[PDB]
Design a binder for this molecule. Structure first.
Ligand code: HEM
Length: 154
């Protein structure tokens, strides 16, 4: 499950493009997640009333949430697998307060990949997409192990 340095640089080089406008990327990723897997929207008490993509795009609070979420993910990715400290708080909140199954982490990973594939073909060819998938699989593996330590089946 361990990534090479080369693989991490493919991850970080596409992430550098996300960081030109993290808010806009976050909006596109949430819209993709909620349209592909509508059940995931039901986990968001503050956003579950949004009915359409237009409402999602107009939500300033959802935009701010996407910035928080992608910035936390980016800090994980920049650790290049040495992310134990970052995963502790995230696993605890997601297991115990939000109750987010591993299957829903797989869905958001799919939405991230889809949006990078569409926006960033210059830095998201097949090898770069493979490296990003490996990094998100590692994240999900390590979160699942923490979930189990915390008492949550995931
Ligand atoms: C890449 C994966 C994800 C990352 C990095 C991430 C990160 C975060 C962060 C940093 C927060 C705020 C602090 C906290 O409560 O822990 C948060 C809140 C939250 N997350 Fe996630 N998250 C991820 C995936 C998901 C998914 C897939 C769902 C639901 C389907 C979800 C549901 C929530 C909810 C319900 C909150 C509270 C939102 C609010 O305050 O209105 N998360 N997430």
């Amino acid at each position: 499950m361990v990534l090479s340095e080369g693989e991490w640089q493919l991850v970080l080089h596409v992430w550098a493009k996300v960081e030109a406008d993290v808010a806009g990327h976050g909006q596109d990723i949430y819209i993709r997640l909620f349209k592909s897997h509508p059940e995931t929207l039901e986990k968001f008490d503050r956003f579950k009333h949004l009915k359409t993509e237009a409402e999602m795009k107009a939500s300033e609070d959802l935009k701010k949430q996407g910035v928080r979420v992608l910035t936390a993910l980016g800090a994980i990715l920049k650790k290049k697998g040495h992310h134990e400290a970052e995963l502790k708080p995230l696993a605890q909140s997601h297991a115990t307060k939000h109750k987010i199954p591993i299957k829903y982490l797989e869905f958001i990973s799919e939405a991230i990949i889809h949006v990078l594939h569409s926006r960033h073909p210059g830095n998201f060819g097949a090898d770069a997409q493979g490296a990003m998938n490996k990094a998100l699989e590692l994240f999900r593996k390590d979160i699942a192990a923490k979930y189990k330590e915390l008492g949550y089946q995931g």
